[PDB]
Paper text:
[name] plays an important role in copper homeostasis by oxidation of toxic cuprous ions to cupric ions. As with all multi-copper oxidases, it contains four copper atoms distributed within one type 1 (T1)2 copper site and a trinuclear cluster comprising the T2 and T3 copper sites. A distinguishing feature of [name] is a partially structured 45-amino acid segment (residues 356–404) capping the entrance to the T1/sCu copper-binding sites. The goal of the current study was to engineer the highly compliant MRS such that [name] activity would be modulated by engagement of a partner protein with a scaffolded peptide.
Author numbering: 29 to 379, 402 to 519
Amino acid sequence: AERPTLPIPDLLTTDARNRIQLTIGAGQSTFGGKTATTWGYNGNLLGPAVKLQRGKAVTVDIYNQLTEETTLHWHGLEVPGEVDGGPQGIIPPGGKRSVTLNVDQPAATCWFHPHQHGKTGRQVAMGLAGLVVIEDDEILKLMLPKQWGIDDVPVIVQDKKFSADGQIDYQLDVMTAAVGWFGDTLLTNGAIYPQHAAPRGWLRLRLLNGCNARSLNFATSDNRPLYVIASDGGLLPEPVKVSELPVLMGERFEVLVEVNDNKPFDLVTLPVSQMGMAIAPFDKPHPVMRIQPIAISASGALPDTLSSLPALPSLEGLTVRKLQLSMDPILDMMGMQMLMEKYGDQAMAGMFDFHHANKINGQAFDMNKPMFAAAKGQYERWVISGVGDMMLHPFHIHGTQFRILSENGKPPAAHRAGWKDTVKVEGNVSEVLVKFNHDAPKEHAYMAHCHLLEHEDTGMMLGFTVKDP
């Protein structure tokens, strides 16, 4: 009858021993009345919100209760490579690995997910993702909405496709290696079109695009504005009012939205210009969740000023690193053909071993050979080109929060000008200003890769190390 309520990830903080336990395991979820095998952190699906504090360290004990290897990448955390959880962070099935997270970065919503070599897309599709809520001394002074699960709410948005038996229907084949794995069912914290009761006043949504390959574009059903207050790596200097908010795979934004009177409204996602992603029902605005106003306590506010953003340093004398993304023309031809044959023209609306056909600087990912050594504690200019390549590539660099200088041909939109760990590359060139505060040796290198997961799984990744020059 009624919509399910929005599931709220548990806020998970350290214990008296300053430890946090994460169990990775297989269970069961229900989607549209049909049960499915799913994977989760501390549960059947998705995961908790690990809560960290700047200036404090926590030890996370990770128990892998799957029957296959996995890793745990702390997406957005400025931590050394040894705990970064790239493909070299193997956790054996039935085994346990512990990492120390010594947090030293501004308040932010980050997240965590597998980075198993060649299998990251499958493991995310099966259910593995969690959140990270970093707080500091600055953000709690602001009196933003702060009641977790009431007026401060995480919103993890993901698509899946299921086979007739109800099971998740994941495949890494020549089509998905080209355009990505995408589905026809939209999930919001694991539920289909849930409702969230929100007190009158301001509602804070921590948005995460957790799709393998689908880009999203958030808006409200009645075109009330969203006020962006934070990006991947934390607060903007001041709120940025937008009518729609595109969000790439793996990106987070925090928005405030007004909840007035008592009329419900929807958070929705608007059709995107991305290949494969405008097939019905995604050819039209698609609801994400229903917001239901209520009359309980809430004192959160939208501040005029949020934080201070340092100036972009001088580009003069900085090391420039060039990263050329590419796809084997045969993969582009064959994958495109299969997409068009199956879905037809709508797959372009609004516009052979494939396992190593996606590449950076002419090379599919080689775990034994980091491509370069970056300087610790020094700004570098990284130039990432998708010239000659049709596809969307949200490009993620581990171990940093960087500043976008140029995004795919233009300066970043204001709400994208702050701290980011992902930058858009699509048929043009992006430039980012990056600094690495922590070491990563050859045996636990940082990754830089496309976050369209099927591209990463088929080669579009490089490792790099960081050491004091």
